[PDB]
Design an enzyme around this catalytic site. Structure first.
Site, PDB file in Angstrom:
ATOM      1  N   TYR B 130       0.806  -1.286   0.017  1.00  0.00           N
ATOM      2  CA  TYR B 130       0.199   0.076  -0.001  1.00  0.00           C
ATOM      3  C   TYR B 130       0.983   1.087   0.041  1.00  0.00           C
ATOM      4  O   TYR B 130       1.830   1.353   1.057  1.00  0.00           O
ATOM      5  CB  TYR B 130      -0.802   0.181   1.196  1.00  0.00           C
ATOM      6  CG  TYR B 130      -1.170  -1.192   1.716  1.00  0.00           C
ATOM      7  CD1 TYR B 130      -1.999  -2.162   1.378  1.00  0.00           C
ATOM      8  CD2 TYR B 130      -0.527  -1.766   2.730  1.00  0.00           C
ATOM      9  CE1 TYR B 130      -2.350  -3.530   1.610  1.00  0.00           C
ATOM     10  CE2 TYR B 130      -0.773  -2.946   3.303  1.00  0.00           C
ATOM     11  CZ  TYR B 130      -1.901  -3.833   2.798  1.00  0.00           C
ATOM     12  OH  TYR B 130      -1.985  -5.253   3.414  1.00  0.00           O
ATOM     13  N   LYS B 137      -8.312   6.175  -3.643  1.00  0.00           N
ATOM     14  CA  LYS B 137      -9.669   7.143  -3.439  1.00  0.00           C
ATOM     15  C   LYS B 137     -10.164   7.770  -4.649  1.00  0.00           C
ATOM     16  O   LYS B 137     -11.076   7.169  -5.455  1.00  0.00           O
ATOM     17  CB  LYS B 137      -9.482   8.150  -2.370  1.00  0.00           C
ATOM     18  CG  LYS B 137      -8.960   7.624  -0.898  1.00  0.00           C
ATOM     19  CD  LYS B 137      -9.103   8.774   0.062  1.00  0.00           C
ATOM     20  CE  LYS B 137      -8.400   9.762   0.007  1.00  0.00           C
ATOM     21  NZ  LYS B 137      -7.387   9.907   1.057  1.00  0.00           N
TER      22      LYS B 137
END
Ligand code: NA
Ligand code: NA
Ligand code: NA
Ligand code: NA
Lengths: 221, 221, 221, 221
Positions: B130, B137
């Site tokens: 990540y 988003k």
């Protein structure tokens, strides 16, 4: 009952810009009044401290505090707040009714206002909808992010609401009526209901956000 | 008292993705349980319907409904929901626990879920953090805006929460600890407290939004 | 004359993805060929090394270099480039013809390709326009910014072109025809003319950009 | 040779804001002068029509046209341009040297300027880098997109360049020196080299764009 997880019963807010009886700050005042909050009041110019002593007759507010503050005018803001701090003491937050015609004002009072929030607080700042843009939220959004950082250290949260078109306060917004996902407009109450969220304890870990109370229209983009 | 302006006393939510006892959906469940809401429950795989019959022992939930739903797997979602609709009836919203590993899932259940919200509803969808991104988003944000439009007509609101780093669920997030304006992390409760906002009636005219419950860190950018 | 401030006379590019005779890479090849550039050639699959030995009959390219590279397939890319470096030597840039179906590919070859640009270079990467998005440029945009940083230190510039709808390669793009500020579509040449900019020396201090060669349509948003 | 695909040999530009000998418009003037372009000249205030009659001694410009235009001041812009149109005739583009201190100005001259581009044109507009923002490009970006639409119909392209820090025209930009992917700053020439792109025919299907000539620093974000 136990939705005391809002806090907001008893805490004291300063509500600014609460011009006539359809002003949004007036929805925010009522949702708030209704939730238990002592409130304090800023009038920006003259007179209207009438509509007010009046206005407040609908709210169960057992003391009655009003302060002429021209946000436009700085010491008008500084002796507003040390005045208030004198007069009633510490706040838990202030709603505020927003070139920086209105940007600076926020900035100023942010800074004035924190001297009253010694254990910390919540400041909400609203814009309403001129062409455009936006820019104009971009800018807004940003001026709230900056404040977020600043008073974050002091545990004061800072957020904005961006307020869609509201009838009762170009009749081509019949447009939103008809394209906003929920196919209706917003009013004050549904604006000040988000304000309650925002000043309240549920929005606990939320700061530097812009919550569009606008039936969903921002999504059109 | 009169903070029945949330509604949420008695309304029924479907809470999905409520994996162990530190899952966020588990904070959302409790803030909710605490507010009066009947709740329904989706387990995604096997077993854990235990942690659950267990888990629910902390909640005052007088009936006890659980449904194995693999969100991954569609009819698993379709007979989940007609099952539920059979079993208990109409919902007021579902919390959901989010390539589209997890995008599609939302989409699917959105659509399944509305058949239960005949007078309308609220669907919340969370992501957590990540590398990156985000994108990630951008994409999320967008996939909620699209749904916003769709079920807007049917008066179902659709919003996302984006969930910052939470300890109790790379120890370089000591970074946020130390740069996020409020200088702390979030947990579940403060996530599910915003969830309450979002499914509740206060977020009335709010849809297609992304509310970052992340101590203010998005603002760092 | 003295518009040798492009450089690009004599420098060597690798042009990839130059599928048939209407492929954009084919416009880029010609604008380039026309400007003086030796060129090298990647074919991704089979055959078409024909359309090519053919294709190149329109270009004045006195040596004729082609390399089957499946971008999809990594060593296919590694022995492409050390092959090339063997075969002809150092490049000044590569045009490249772009989940990451096509993102990774770029990334890979970026990295392979720099071993040939020891004094530095220019890499262009194109996308074309499915619904959407974008996201999808957001992501693209980003994957070029990341590369920008990486090979910036080594003086290799990295930029993207985003390519609007082009007829000769949903007939509802009659839509752009009719809403794009210049009221027309783009073709290959006007794409590869920007490619020339981008690989050339005029775009000297420009890297990590996305230049939309799309008659102005991005502005519609 | 045949890099007449720029056009720009013989076409006439109006170059504005070309204050002293390190002004960027001065790089743009030279790259241009060097490429064949007749040029016209706006001085904004007083005097400097000297640095100029002087300045132009480095350029091979066989006629020598200068016009005092205060961009600040509108008829100053209107009789500038009908003046020019009188005096020399039709332009192919104008470089322009950019609340709207400087936004409006662009807008104004856009509109004035098109009356001279009857077969159409190219207008470039630069900003340089104060805190911030940006906003400030957001706004800029936008004010160019709007113009893009307007004069798109009339085949005038409109684009912006955003100009990074340039030494020879806070010494904490040693910061960019050291974080901008190419690890150096830009100067005028590399700014006006992109200007050439932009006014020239290679940027043919490009309009409403913002090309950052800034060593790659925008990507840092
Ligand atoms: Na709709
Ligand atoms: Na901080
Ligand atoms: Na148009
Ligand atoms: Na670097």
């Amino acid at each position: 009952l136990a939705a005391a997880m809002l806090n907001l019963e008893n805490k004291t807010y300063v509500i600014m810009g609460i011009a006539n009886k359809r002003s949004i700050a007036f929805g925010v005042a009522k949702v708030l009044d209704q939730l238990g909050a002592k409130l304090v009041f800023t009038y920006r110019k003259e007179r209207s401290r009438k509509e007010l002593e009046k206005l407040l007759e609908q709210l169960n507010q057992p003391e009655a505090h009003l302060y002429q503050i021209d946000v436009q005018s700085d010491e008008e803001v500084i002796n507003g707040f040390e005045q208030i701090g004198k007069d009633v003491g510490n706040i838990d937050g202030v709603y505020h009714s927003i070139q920086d015609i209105s940007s600076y004002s926020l900035t100023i009072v942010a800074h004035e206002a924190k001297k009253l929030m010694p254990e910390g607080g919540s400041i909400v700042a609203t814009t309403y909808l001129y062409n455009v843009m936006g820019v104009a939220k971009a800018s807004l959004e940003a001026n709230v992010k900056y404040l977020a950082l600043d008073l974050g250290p002091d545990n004061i949260r800072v957020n904005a609401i961006s307020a869609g078109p509201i009838r009762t306060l170009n009749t081509i917004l019949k447009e939103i009526e008809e394209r906003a996902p929920l196919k209706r407009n917003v009013d004050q109450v549904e604006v000040g209901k988000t304000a309650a969220y925002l000043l309240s304890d549920l929005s606990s870990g939320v700061t530097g956000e812009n919550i569009h109370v606008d039936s969903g229209f921002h999504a059109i983009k």
